[PDB]
Write a protein that holds these residues in place. Sequence first.
Motif, PDB file in Angstrom:
ATOM      1  N   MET A   1      26.402  44.122  43.125  1.00 48.95           N
ATOM      2  CA  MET A   1      26.522  45.570  43.344  1.00 48.95           C
ATOM      3  C   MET A   1      26.852  46.252  42.049  1.00 48.95           C
ATOM      4  SD  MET A   1      28.458  46.139  46.895  1.00 48.95           S
ATOM      5  CE  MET A   1      28.157  47.902  46.934  1.00 48.95           C
ATOM      6  N   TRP A   2      27.885  45.738  41.381  1.00 51.68           N
ATOM      7  CA  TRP A   2      28.403  46.249  40.102  1.00 51.68           C
ATOM      8  C   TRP A   2      27.321  46.193  39.017  1.00 51.68           C
ATOM      9  CZ3 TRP A   2      29.256  44.830  35.118  1.00 51.68           C
ATOM     10  CH2 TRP A   2      30.220  45.580  34.386  1.00 51.68           C
ATOM     11  N   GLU A   3      26.586  45.084  39.027  1.00 51.66           N
ATOM     12  CA  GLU A   3      25.489  44.851  38.104  1.00 51.66           C
ATOM     13  C   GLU A   3      24.380  45.858  38.307  1.00 51.66           C
ATOM     14  OE1 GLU A   3      24.822  40.330  38.825  1.00 51.66           O
ATOM     15  OE2 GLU A   3      24.537  40.462  36.709  1.00 51.66           O
ATOM     16  N   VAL A   4      24.151  46.234  39.564  1.00 51.04           N
ATOM     17  CA  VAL A   4      23.115  47.243  39.843  1.00 51.04           C
ATOM     18  C   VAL A   4      23.536  48.651  39.427  1.00 51.04           C
ATOM     19  CG1 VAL A   4      21.802  48.425  41.626  1.00 51.04           C
ATOM     20  CG2 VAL A   4      21.993  45.890  41.617  1.00 51.04           C
ATOM     21  N   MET A   5      24.744  49.046  39.842  1.00 49.70           N
ATOM     22  CA  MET A   5      25.206  50.415  39.589  1.00 49.70           C
ATOM     23  C   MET A   5      25.548  50.625  38.105  1.00 49.70           C
ATOM     24  SD  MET A   5      24.759  51.349  42.690  1.00 49.70           S
ATOM     25  CE  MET A   5      25.089  53.100  42.302  1.00 49.70           C
ATOM     26  N   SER A   6      25.571  49.570  37.301  1.00 52.66           N
ATOM     27  CA  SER A   6      25.786  49.743  35.868  1.00 52.66           C
ATOM     28  C   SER A   6      24.476  49.456  35.132  1.00 52.66           C
ATOM     29  CB  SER A   6      26.910  48.831  35.322  1.00 52.66           C
ATOM     30  OG  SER A   6      26.484  47.471  35.221  1.00 52.66           O
TER      31      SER A   6
ATOM     32  N   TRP B   1      31.903  42.077  30.791  1.00 53.23           N
ATOM     33  CA  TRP B   1      31.465  42.201  29.387  1.00 53.23           C
ATOM     34  C   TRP B   1      31.682  40.903  28.623  1.00 53.23           C
ATOM     35  CZ3 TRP B   1      34.155  45.843  32.179  1.00 53.23           C
ATOM     36  CH2 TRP B   1      33.434  46.988  32.528  1.00 53.23           C
ATOM     37  N   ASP B   2      32.438  40.959  27.547  1.00 54.19           N
ATOM     38  CA  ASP B   2      32.593  39.809  26.657  1.00 54.19           C
ATOM     39  C   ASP B   2      33.933  39.090  26.900  1.00 54.19           C
ATOM     40  OD1 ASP B   2      34.165  41.878  25.747  1.00 54.19           O
ATOM     41  OD2 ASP B   2      33.702  41.554  23.625  1.00 54.19           O
ATOM     42  N   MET B   3      34.585  39.360  28.030  1.00 56.41           N
ATOM     43  CA  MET B   3      35.743  38.585  28.476  1.00 56.41           C
ATOM     44  C   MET B   3      35.308  37.123  28.627  1.00 56.41           C
ATOM     45  SD  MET B   3      37.544  41.024  31.516  1.00 56.41           S
ATOM     46  CE  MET B   3      38.746  39.759  31.929  1.00 56.41           C
ATOM     47  N   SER B   4      36.126  36.193  28.158  1.00 52.36           N
ATOM     48  CA  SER B   4      35.834  34.756  28.301  1.00 52.36           C
ATOM     49  C   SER B   4      35.962  34.289  29.764  1.00 52.36           C
ATOM     50  CB  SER B   4      36.779  33.945  27.421  1.00 52.36           C
ATOM     51  OG  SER B   4      38.085  33.917  27.963  1.00 52.36           O
ATOM     52  N   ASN B   5      35.394  33.125  30.067  1.00 54.97           N
ATOM     53  CA  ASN B   5      35.518  32.544  31.409  1.00 54.97           C
ATOM     54  C   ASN B   5      36.974  32.403  31.879  1.00 54.97           C
ATOM     55  OD1 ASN B   5      32.760  32.399  31.857  1.00 54.97           O
ATOM     56  ND2 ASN B   5      32.648  30.174  31.611  1.00 54.97           N
TER      57      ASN B   5
END
Length: 267
Positions: free
Chosen positions: A188-193, A200-204
Motif C-alpha cells: 500500500m505504502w509502496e503504491v501511494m509513494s 528508505w536506506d534504513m538497514s535490515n
Amino acid sequence: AKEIDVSFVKIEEVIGAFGEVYKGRLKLPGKREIYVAIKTLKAGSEKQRRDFLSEASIMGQFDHPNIIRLEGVVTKSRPVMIITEFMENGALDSFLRQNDGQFTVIQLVGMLRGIAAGMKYLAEMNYVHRDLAARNILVNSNLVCKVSDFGLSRYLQGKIPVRWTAPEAIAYRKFTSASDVWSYGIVMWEVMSFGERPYWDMSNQDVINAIEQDYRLPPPMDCPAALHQLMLDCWQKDRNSRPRFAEIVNTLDKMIRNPASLKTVAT
C-alpha cells in the motif's frame, strides 16, 4: 503445469534478470499466437530445478483476474522455463516510479483493490504468499495489477528480504495470511509513494529494531488519512487484530464508492 513443446516458444528480447525473463511469442497448435513472459533457470541441480518449477505448480492452481496466468512449462529440455501471460507495464514499483505523480488517488486505490482481491483469493485457497512486495506485482496495459512470483509460497494444506515481512514471521518463522496482510500494508505504502523503497536506506536491523519499538512508516506525501489508517491496521503488532483480506477488499470498495472520504490528507 501444461508441458509446452519448445517449437511453440519463440524467445525475443530480454526484459529482465537465477536466470532471465524474456518477452516471447507462443504458437499453440490451433491457437492464435500470443505474447508471453518466459522465466528460465540457468541450466547448471535437480533440487534447484524442482523448486524452480514448483512455482509453476502452485501458479497453475489459480484462476483469478488478479493472479498471474500460467500458459505452461518446459521441463524436458534445458533451460527449463515457466511461461506466463505478458504484462505490458512490468513490475508495479518501477512502473509507478516511471509515472511519478501521474495517476489519481482513485486509480491507485483501484490497483490496491486488485492486489487485495488477488490475495483474498490466495488466502481462501489456503496459500501463504510470503513474498508479497510491489516488485512481485505485475501490471498490464489497462492498469490491472496481478499478484505474481509464487516461489516462496506455501500451500497450508539469494539475500532474502526483511522489510516486507511481519515481525512475528521474521522472529519465529511464523508465516500466515496475517503476515501477508502486513506485507499488503507495505505494498500500500509502496503504491501511494509511487515506488519508494520501504524504510528508505534504513538497514535490515534498523527496520527490525524500529518495528519492535512500535515505529511505523509515516504517510506518503498527499496520502489520504483513511488509506494511511488501513496501512496502520495492516501493521498491528498482534496479528489477530489485523484485518483479513476480505475486510480489506470491502474497505477499499467503500472508499471507491465514497471518494470524498479520500480528500482528507494524513500527510
